[PDB]
Amino acid sequence: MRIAVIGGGSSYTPELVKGLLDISEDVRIDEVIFYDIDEEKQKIVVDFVKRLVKDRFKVLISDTFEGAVVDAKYVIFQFRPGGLKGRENDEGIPLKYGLIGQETTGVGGFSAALRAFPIVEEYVDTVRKTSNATIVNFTNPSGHITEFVRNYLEYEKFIGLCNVPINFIREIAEMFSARLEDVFLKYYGLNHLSFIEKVFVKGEDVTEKVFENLKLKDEDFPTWFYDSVRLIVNPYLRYYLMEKKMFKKISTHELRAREVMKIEKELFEKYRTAVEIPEELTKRGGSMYSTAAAHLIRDLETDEGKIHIVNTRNNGSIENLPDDYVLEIPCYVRSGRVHTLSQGKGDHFALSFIHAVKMYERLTIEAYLKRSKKLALKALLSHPLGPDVEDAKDLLEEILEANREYVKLG
Amino acid sequence: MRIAVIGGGSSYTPELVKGLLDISEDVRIDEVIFYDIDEEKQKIVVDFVKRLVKDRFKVLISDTFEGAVVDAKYVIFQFRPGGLKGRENDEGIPLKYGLIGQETTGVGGFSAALRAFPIVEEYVDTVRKTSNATIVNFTNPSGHITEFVRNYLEYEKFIGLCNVPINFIREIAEMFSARLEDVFLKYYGLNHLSFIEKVFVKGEDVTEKVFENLKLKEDFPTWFYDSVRLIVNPYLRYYLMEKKMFKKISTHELRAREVMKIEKELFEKYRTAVEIPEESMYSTAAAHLIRDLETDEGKIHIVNTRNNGSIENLPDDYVLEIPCYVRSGRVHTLSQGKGDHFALSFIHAVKMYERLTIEAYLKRSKKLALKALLSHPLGPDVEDAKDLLEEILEANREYVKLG
Amino acid sequence: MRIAVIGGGSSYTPELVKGLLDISEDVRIDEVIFYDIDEEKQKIVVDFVKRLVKDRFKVLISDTFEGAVVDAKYVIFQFRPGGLKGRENDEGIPLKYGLIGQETTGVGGFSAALRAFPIVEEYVDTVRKTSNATIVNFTNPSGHITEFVRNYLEYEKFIGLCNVPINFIREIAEMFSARLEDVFLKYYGLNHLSFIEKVFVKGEDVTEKVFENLKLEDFPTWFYDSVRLIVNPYLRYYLMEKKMFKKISTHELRAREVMKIEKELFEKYRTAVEIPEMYSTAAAHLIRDLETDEGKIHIVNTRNNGSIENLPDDYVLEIPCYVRSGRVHTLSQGKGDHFALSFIHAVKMYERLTIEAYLKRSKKLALKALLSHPLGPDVEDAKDLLEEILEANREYVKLG
Amino acid sequence: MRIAVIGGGSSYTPELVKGLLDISEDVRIDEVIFYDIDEEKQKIVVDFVKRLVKDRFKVLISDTFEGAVVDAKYVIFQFRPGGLKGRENDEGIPLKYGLIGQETTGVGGFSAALRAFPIVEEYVDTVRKTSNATIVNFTNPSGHITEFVRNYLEYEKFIGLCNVPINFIREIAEMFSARLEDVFLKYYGLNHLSFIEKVFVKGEDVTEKVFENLKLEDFPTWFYDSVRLIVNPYLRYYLMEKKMFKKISTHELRAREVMKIEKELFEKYRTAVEIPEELTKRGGSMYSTAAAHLIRDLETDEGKIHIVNTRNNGSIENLPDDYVLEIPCYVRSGRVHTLSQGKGDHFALSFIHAVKMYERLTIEAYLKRSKKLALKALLSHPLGPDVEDAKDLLEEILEANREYVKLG
C-alpha cells in the first residue's frame, strides 16, 4: 500500500503528512513517495517530513511522475501549475478591466484552468496506463478540473477536494461540542460556489440556531440576506453578490499571491531546522485540506462507510440538476467507492449560479480541447464575472501572452 | 366566433384590427369586443377601428372584463399595467444604482412582472370560469407572464407572443425574396433572450450567408459572430454590453417619455383618421396565430410555451420561445436537438430569476423578493438590494403589496 | 417513545417483540401498544408477549386504531386484510383460468391489493391527522402498497419492508463468516421482483464466488451464466410459469397450510415461556437505525430518486438506503440491467393501473389493470375472472 | 436526383414504382436504380416496371449494392433476408414449444432480426462511406432494425416505415369523406405494437365516433370501453395468445400461402401492361404510398405529417428520449421533426418498455455474437420461452439460420 504525492514541495506537505500519520494507526501505509518539478524545494520539505515521520512509514522521492504513481493506490494532486507567479497574473491581469481578479473565481480561475488542463491530461493518462490509482485532487481550480477529468477524460476514480466543507463542519462541531461525524449537512453547489440548506447535529435540525448564530460575529452579508435567501453561502459568493465591494478591496491592496510568496518563503526557512510543525502554517490559507485528504483515504480504505463532502458527478444527489454535473456534495464513502446520497431539490437561487458557471466550465474545456481562441472568447464571455464584449479580445490576448509557456491557443 | 381584446385603448389596436381584417377572408370572425380600464382612451381608438372595419364584422365594447371574455374563443391580452408612468419608473429607478433600466429586461422587468401578476391572475381566473378561451398574450413581460400562467396558475391555453421572431423572419424573407413561411429557423431562448442557430430558406441552409450579411449592416463586432456562432436577440446587448448600454440609457431621455409623446400624437391622429397613419408588427403575429389555430392547415409559429422536448438540453417545463406546429386549436412543439452552452447559461440564469420572482409574488414576501432581485444577472449587489426594492415597492404601491 | 403495532394478533408478533427487546438496549422504548380487529386472537398473543417482555417496556392494548397510533413515533402495519380466507381466494381463483395463483404475485396480488387500499387509506389518514409517525409496512403486497402511499396518498414517511433482502444478506454473511453489515449489495427491483447484480463482503467483490456457490424447481446453471443476475425466487413464477402452475395446481393451496401452522402456534402461545421453533429483525433494525444518528444501510421500499439512473425517480423500488435520524437516503447504484428493467417497468405500469382503478372505483379500469399484468388473463378470460374476484371480495371492495 | 431500391425483385416493386410515378409530377426524379441478390427474379419485375414507367424516368439495374447507392439521395430497403423459407422457419419453429410463430412478433421476429443485422450493418456502412443517402426501411422487423441503426450503428438518416399507420389513416379518411392529410392522430408505440389515443378529422375530435364505429378473432366491445385505446391488430398476439396460437397452429403457415401468391404474381408480370388486382389487394401493398409520400415530403419544403419510426425526442414525455418509436413527425426539406403529444397511457407503456428491453437485449447479443446473451434476450420477450424451453429453442433457431448468423 503506497501513496504518491504530486507537488511534494508544497508548503502544505508537512500538514498532509501529519494527517497521513494520524490515520496510519487505523490503516496500513507502507510508503509515501513524493514528486515535484522543483527538486530543490522538495528536498527541504521532504527532509522535514522525514523528521516528523520517524520511520513510521517509508518516505521516498521519485525523479519522474511515472516513477511516483506506478505502484500507488492513491495519488494526491497538490501542485500549482505556473506557480505563484501564475497566481499573481491571475489576480493582477483582470483588474485593469474592472474585473474581479481572484485565484479560483472568475477570469482568474479561467487562466488557472487553461494552465492546468495540459498537465492533468498528461498526468491522468500516465496514471491510467499504470497503477489505475484513485486520484485525490487539490490542484485549483479543483471542481473545474474534476469536471474535466470526470466528463471529458472519462477517468472515473478522480475525486476533487476542497478545504471549505471541512472548515464549515469543524466550525459547527465546536459550536455544538460534537465530533466531526456528528455533523450532517444538506450541501450542494460547485467548488467555491456552494450552499448549505440544512444543518444537523447528532440528528437534531439546528439550521435555525446556526442562522441566529451567524448574525452575532462590512465585508460579510447583512442579516437581512440570511433572512431572505435562507441559505448558508460559501464566502466566495461575495465575489458574485458583492462585486463592487470586492473589486474595490482587491484593487486597493497588495495582490494576495505576493503575500503568500512572503509567507511561503518564511515557512521554508523554518523548515530547514523545524522539529515540529510551525504555527505560521496552521493559521493560514486552507491548512486543514490535510485532514480532508487523509480522512478520505482512510475511509476509502476501510469498509466502515462514512460521509465526505467531495467533488463528483451529481448522480441524483440533487434531483433538480443533470446527473452529469460535477458537484460538491456529501457522499457515502466505503471500500474504494464513492456513493452519492439523495438530498432532494436544490434552491432556484443556488441553481442560477450552479447552471451559469457549469456552462462556463464546459465552454472552457471545449475551448481547450479544440485549442481554439474563438471558443475561449466564447467561454470568457459566458462567465458571470467575465468581460463585456468591448474588453474580451484584449483580455484574452493578455491572458495567453502571460501563459505562453503553459498553453497555446490557435 | 368572437375575439376579445383586453386593452382596447392601446395605440397598437388599429394594426391588430388590420390584421384581423386580413385573416377574416380565410377564417370566420363574427365580432371583436374591446375592453379597457380607460373608457375614454378606448372610445377614440374603437371609433377609428369602426371606420376601418366598415361592417366586415361587429365591433363591440364591454364595460367589464367578464363581459368581454364570456363568449370569446380567443382573448388577446395587450394591456400595460401601471401604464407608461409605470414604464418610466421601471426604466428610471434602477439607473441611480448603476443598474440597467429597461422596460422588459433586468430590474425593470422585475417591477413590471410584479405589477402584472395580480391582474393576470384575476383575468385568467375569470376566463377559466367562463369561456375557457385561448389567451394570446402581448402584455410585458410576455415570457415571464407565460411562465407564470403555464406553470403556476396551470392554465394550458395561454400562448405568449413577442414581436422579435416575426421581425427577424420578415427581414430574412426580404433578403432572400421569399414568403414568410419559406423561412424556417432553429430558434430558442426566453422572450427577449433568444438565439438563432440555423437559418433555412426554401429548404436551403443559408446560415453562413446570413452571418456574412450581418457584417455589412452599438451592435456586436464581427469577431463576436465568428466566436459565439449564434444570431443573438438585440436585448442581449444589455447583458453582454452592459457598460455601453448603461452609458447610453443614463445620458438620454428615458424611452417611456418618448413613447408618451408618440402616443399622444397618434391619438390626436386617431380622432380624425380614415386610414392607418405611417407613424407594430406584433399585429401580424397575433392574427396569423389565431388564423392558424382556427384552420386545420398546420403552420409554424414561434411562440412562448413549455419546452416539451424542443430543446433536449433543457427541462420539459421551462417556458421557451420556440417554433411550434399550430393546428386546430393545438400547439405542438418540434424537435430541435441541443441548445448551445452559451445560450443555456443565460436561459438557466434568468429562468431561475423568473421562478424566484413568481414565488415571491405568490407568498407576497419581501424577503423572497430580495432573493429574486439578487438572482438576476443584471440585478443589484447586496449593498443596493434593500434600498432598490424599497424604492420599487413604494413606486408600485397601488399595484402590489408585499409583506 | 412509543411504538404502535397494527395487527397484534399476527402469529409473527412474538418474533417482532423479540426484535424490539434486542434493540431496547441501544435505543429507548417506553411502550409498545397493540391493535387488532380480532380482540380474542390478540389477547392470547399479547399475553405471551408480556411473559417474554418481563416489564422491560410497557405492553398495552388499544381498543381503536386511533388510540394505538395517537402518541406513536413508529407504527408497524402487519395486518392481513381479509385474513387467510382472503389469501385462499387469491391463490385459488386464478387457478381456474390457467393463471398463477399466488399470495403476492400476479392476479393473486391484484385482489390482495384491492383489499388493502381502503384500509391503508383510512389508517394512513388517521396517522397523518394525529402523530405523523413513521409507518413501517409488512402488509402485502408491501411494495405495491408503498407505491400507493408514496405517490398517490402522498405520505412521505411510509417505508415498505420485506423479508427477502435480509434473508439473502444473512445467507451471504454465514457463507463468508461475516456480520450482516459486512455485506453490501447492488440490489434493485420491486418487492418480490428484485435482482442482485453485485455482492461485496468486507469490501471485497465476491459476486463470482457467490455465482459459483449457487450452482452447488430452481434455475439451471446456464441461466446464471446468461442473465448474470441473482434473481429473487419469486421470478420463478414469471420465468418458469408452466412449471410453477403445474406445482401450485396439484397440491394443497399454501394458505391452507399456513392456517394449520398458525392454529398450531396459537395453541402453543397459550402456555409457552419461550419462543417456539426474519421480518422481525428487519423491522427492529430499521427502527433502531431511524432512532440513532449512526447511519446504516437497509434495503427498503421507497422512491428511486436516482438509485438507478436508468429508471424514473418516482418508481418505488426495493433498494439499499442510508438510514439515519429519522431520514432515509437513497444511494447511487448506476444503471439497471435491461433484463431486470423489462420486469420492473411492466409490473410498475400494472401497479399504477391497479391504483388508478381503485381510486376511480372503476370496473372498466380494473379490467385494464388485469390485462396489463405479465401473469394476467387473456382477453377471453378477463371479464369472468374479474367478476369472480369482486364477488369473493364483496365485503372489502366495491367497484362500479 | 437518384433513388436506389434495394430488393428490386420484391413482388411489391410495381406498387412502389406506381407511387414514385405519382409523385414525379411534384418532385424531380431522374433515375431509379434497382439491386437484388436474385438477378433473375429482378429482371422479370424490372422489365414490368419499364412498361409502367414509360420513360418518365430512367430505370437502371446495378450489379452491386455499392453501384446502386453510390449516387443516391434516397435508398429504400425492401429486401427479405433468408427469403420466404426464412419466414417459414420463423413461423414454424416456435410452434412446437407452444409459442406464437409469427413473421415479426415474438420469437419469429427475433430470428428475423438476427438474420437482418449483419446485412444492414454492411449496407448502412457502405451507404455511409459513399452517398450518405437517407435510408427508408421496410425490411422486417422494421422498428427493431431502426432501433439498431439509430442507437447502435448511429446512422441518423434512417427512417423506419410500416404499412399500418397509413392503412389506418385511409380507413378514417373514407369513414369521414376527407383527404389523408385531414386526419391527425395521437399515435405511439413500437412497430407492430402501437396505440391510437385520439383521432382528429379536419380538426374535430372524432375519437368517440371512431370507437362507436369500431363496434359494428377481434377484441370485444368491453375491451374498447376499458382500455380506451385503438390498438394495433398485432396486439392480438399478446392479449389473445391462446386464441392466436390455436389459429396459427391449425392452419397452413402464412409464409407458404404468400409463396403461392408470389409465384402467381410473377407469372402475371411477364406480360402485364397494368398492375394486377391481386397485387392491389394483398400483403401490405399500401406501403408503396407511404414510401413515395415520405420521399416527396423530404424533398419539398411544404412540411407534412408522417407517422414514422424514429427516436422519441419528447414526442411522448412519459418515455425516454432515445426509444425508437413509431410516431407522427413533421417532415420537411430532408429533416424529420418530432411533435409534442404529451403522456402515453400506462397500459401502452407496459408493452412498449417490455419489448424495447427485449429489442436492445437482442441487439447486444448480436453485437457481442453471444449465445449466452441470446438466451437472455429470448427469455425477456413477453412471448418468449420458459426457461425449460429456451436452450432447445435457440439451438433450433441458430441451426436453421446457420448461413446468416453465427453466435459463439
Curated annotation (Swiss-Prot), chain A:
GO terms for biological process: carbohydrate metabolic process. Its EC number is 3.2.1.86. Its cofactor is NAD(+); Mn(2+). The keyword Metal-binding applies. Optimum pH is 8.0. Active from pH 6.5 to 10. The active site is at residue 236. It catalyses: 6-phospho-beta-D-glucosyl-(1->4)-D-glucose + H2O = D-glucose 6-phosphate + D-glucose. NAD(+) binds at residues 1-64. This is 6-phospho-beta-glucosidase BglT. It comes from Thermotoga maritima (strain ATCC 43589 / DSM 3109 / JCM 10099 / NBRC 100826 / MSB8).
From Swiss-Prot, chain B:
It catalyses: 6-phospho-beta-D-glucosyl-(1->4)-D-glucose + H2O = D-glucose 6-phosphate + D-glucose. Its EC number is 3.2.1.86. Mn(2+) binds at residues 162, 192. The record marks 103 as: Increases basicity of active site Tyr. NAD(+) binds at residues 1-64. One of its GO terms (biological process) is carbohydrate metabolic process. InterPro entries: GlycHydrolase_4_CS, Glyco_hydro_4, Glyco_hydro_4_C, Lactate_DH/Glyco_Ohase_4_C, NAD(P)-bd_dom_sf. Optimum pH is 8.0. Active from pH 6.5 to 10. This is 6-phospho-beta-glucosidase BglT.
